[PDB]
Design a protein around this nucleic acid. Sequence first.
DNA 1: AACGAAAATATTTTCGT
DNA 2: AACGAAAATATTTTCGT
Lengths: 338, 338
Amino acid sequence: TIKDVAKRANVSTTTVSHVINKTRFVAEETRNAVWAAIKELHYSPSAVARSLKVNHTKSIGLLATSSEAAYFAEIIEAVEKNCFQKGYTLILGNAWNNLEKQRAYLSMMAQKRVDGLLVMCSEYPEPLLAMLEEYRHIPMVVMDWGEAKADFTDAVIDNAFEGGYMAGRYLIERGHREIGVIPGPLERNTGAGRLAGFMKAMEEAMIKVPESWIVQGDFEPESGYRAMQQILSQPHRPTAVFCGGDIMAMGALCAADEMGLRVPQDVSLIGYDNVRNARYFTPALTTIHQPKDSLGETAFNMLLDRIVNKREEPQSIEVHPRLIERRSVADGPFRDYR
Amino acid sequence: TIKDVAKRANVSTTTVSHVINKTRFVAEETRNAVWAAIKELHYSPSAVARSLKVNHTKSIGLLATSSEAAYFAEIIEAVEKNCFQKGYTLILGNAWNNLEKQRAYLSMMAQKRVDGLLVMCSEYPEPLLAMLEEYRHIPMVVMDWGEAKADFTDAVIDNAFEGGYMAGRYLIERGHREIGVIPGPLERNTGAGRLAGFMKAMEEAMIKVPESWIVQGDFEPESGYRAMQQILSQPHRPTAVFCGGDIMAMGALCAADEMGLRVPQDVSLIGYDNVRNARYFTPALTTIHQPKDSLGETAFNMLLDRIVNKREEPQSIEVHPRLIERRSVADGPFRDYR
DNA sequence: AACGAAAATATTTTCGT
DNA sequence: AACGAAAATATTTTCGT
Ligand code: HPA
Ligand code: HPA
């Protein structure tokens, strides 16, 4: 069809291309004629044909876990922006932590020739780290690891440990000592890593967390609902609680309220993520903020680099969580004593 | 590179293709040899080259508004599923209700030759309905209209009017008569249309809604926060409130609580959407449920049809909202009197 | 019976003059 | 000075025998 435009403008295709891409000088009239034909015929250059020759689709892929979760959704939407303001088109794929699903997507992606790969899989078993190496060619960056798990990728690091620690400290400094904790999957950095940062602070404070007080969650509100229930559904209960993620916390709040508890008069609760609608939780949620836009942009920007400037060496950039004081934490029994 | 595989297997490319696509019979050994070469070379067929010839990218596009909003996020994630379980790859693009942005995406999409187009733009000014016609060729379906706004598309209809009406009725039947309402943008079906369904029920009940009691929102929690504030920040206040969407409602709840109000002992609140985490709102949110998966799948399924079975005529399928009774609405002053 | 030669798909870019 | 001819990119598919 570039033919059809060309013969209607009475010029070569080679010319038609040139005016379209401003790849070289074309006479005014000539350039106008082409436009005219271009308009009449109603022409839309084939991006596929072109990519075939230029060798790049100007389109990147997202091998994600899930897209509904607040945490996720925000990151992605940020990524989309960056892609768009820089020409890239975005292919989104959710693996659901399912190997086959991830193997399939990884393939469709390579075949559809994505220019780069944005990886957010949550849990990375060896089998997965393997598949990834098989694609060490297509440039990529994992955005959800605690450290550099490999050498064939660029990685961005959230410092979820120094966050957990920050969370613990606050509680401590608020006068708390009987603290419980509902963490997210341990096979996750955002789970196991935040937890540990937490426990460190606990140890330096000589605080012990009774195991009847640590309840695993899956980051979904329902899980936090059941964890809170268990923690308070017992003889001795803590005076404060550290929740792995905001959306689980929102589920902790519910149960608390459902059992006549008052947060934070009865129980203080601190979460982690700082989701967009956190402030509108009842009460406004005190939590640890994860820079999600900066995560998105910073990842997209690493990929581009490697992409354009053909970099080959691994790169890892750190990002930092920070505390956000809202209205869900109350002073503790030992506050005055410090 | 299909060449490289072929000459290593000592067979034509034509053969290499055939075994790959099982497009025709190949001898066992021959088929195995090809596989072998295929494996050694580490070959990934070029989906672009192929699409060039077959004329279809086996990939559809989402011209969305935003992707973070709960309402949206859910629909999309549902769409992704359908795409994936049927071979399609998903290109997501958020227009942000920005014409240029929408014009740009619409183009990149046509150029990148999407096989079909899923449209969710929220507000459709004439200028936009126009651009859309310019692409009446590429098969598409709008999923967010109240009726069939045009003839060059398939449409799925939510019946947001019969929902608003349902919402009103409940309140009425609960013993309420002093009701306020924070609706979503009127330029939206989910805004203007739910509102009207509401007001109808109000009229048949001879209830008048004092204008100091109707406050527009933008579907974002913050807006609901300010609307509730205004409604209750006044002399005479209603005994119940109908909120256009759940996430705004969650913002209504906050303010209510912030002003010492008790939902629903003080104010009953009913929303619309039935988002995944609605039940974990404090209190568990009574709302009108919008079948979002069914929306996604049903749209994807219309598109496919038109796609494969080369249909040309418009099609419109209706979907139905339904009431979900939770714990945010209390009996009203006139309950006993009916 | 099982396979190949070559045309085709819609572009870009190299040398031309 | 301003433009074109033709090779190339990585596949599928038509007739062959
Ligand atoms: O895996 C996760 N899911 C949801 N929210 C989260 N916040 C941190 N990690 C996660
Ligand atoms: O446009 C919308 N945005 C967010 N939530 C919604 N629920 C219905 N319509 C909308």
